């Protein structure tokens, strides 16, 4: 794996090592708000993060992941388009070099400054590695970030980034409550898609919240001081780690709201 986000290893190159990059259910996509249709078959969405147990934060050279204890049903996502129980394993973000870009999904071609992905796996498949081989293996809850007021619940994340500046660095990150990253409304769009990085597996039910959260310019400037490189290597700022919108093909985006 030498994929990344540069001119020579970025999204336009991924197909050569990951041919599913040109597949029939790739993510992200543009959400055309006028074409998305309210779906009365959707059950109420249930985000149950009361017992979430965060463990560690890791710079993986592509983003940073806040990882959770997923050895039992502690933080789960259920309902909406989902059949059964999906366990939270990690969250991460995608962001830009400037405030007008960074999200992976777009809304009527609008790009947000960043996008939060809370990744969950379907417990009927027993472990994450089995779940990613299944068309309904994962559920990713996507939340847009706009630059405005600070998000108080983000600042514990922002303040540890200095300790994980480079690829392969991790830090203990216990007792973080991901409920502080949610907007007030759980109105959402949903469609079948993929992981947005290699290996681009078509295993994700995407649930993208309509209401962005606001973060401050200072908060997102701290994301942009991270590094794609390892320690001791030439500094390459971790910015623009987003895949652009992919063809919708034979898919419909469903809305939870009238
Ligand atoms: N942007 S995204 O679509 O939300 C998205 C994109 C890529 C990924 N990639 C992965 O999770 C890659 N990956 C595996 O396959 N296995 C582990 C998790 C389980 C333990 C072993 C390591 C892992 O980290 C996740 C979400
Ligand atoms: Zn992601």
Curated annotation (Swiss-Prot):
Changing residue 60 to L: Reduced activity. Residues 1-257 form the Alpha-carbonic anhydrase domain. One of its GO terms (molecular function) is zinc ion binding. Changing residue 92 to C/D/E/N/Q: Strongly reduced CO(2) hydrase and p-nitrophenyl acetate esterase activities, impaired stability of zinc binding. Changing residue 65 to H: Enhanced proton transfer. Keywords: Acetylation, Cell membrane, Cytoplasm, Disease variant, Lyase, Membrane, Metal-binding, Osteopetrosis, Phosphoprotein, Zinc. Changing residue 65 to L: Reduced activity. Changing residue 195 to E/H/R: Strongly reduced CO(2) hydrase activity. Its EC number is 4.2.1.1, 4.2.1.69. Activated by X-ray, histamine, L-adrenaline, L- and D-phenylalanine, L- and D-histidine, L-His-OMe and beta-Ala-His (carnosine). The record marks 90 as: Involved in the binding of some activators, including histamine and L-histidine. The active site is at residue 62. Zinc. Can also use cobalt(II) with lower efficiency, but not copper(II), nickel(II) and manganese(II). Changing residue 3 to A: Impaired activity, not rescued by 4-methylimidazole (4-MI). Interacts with SLC4A4. Interaction with SLC4A7 regulates SLC4A7 transporter activity. Interacts with SLC26A6 isoform 4 (via C-terminus cytoplasmic domain). This is Carbonic anhydrase 2.
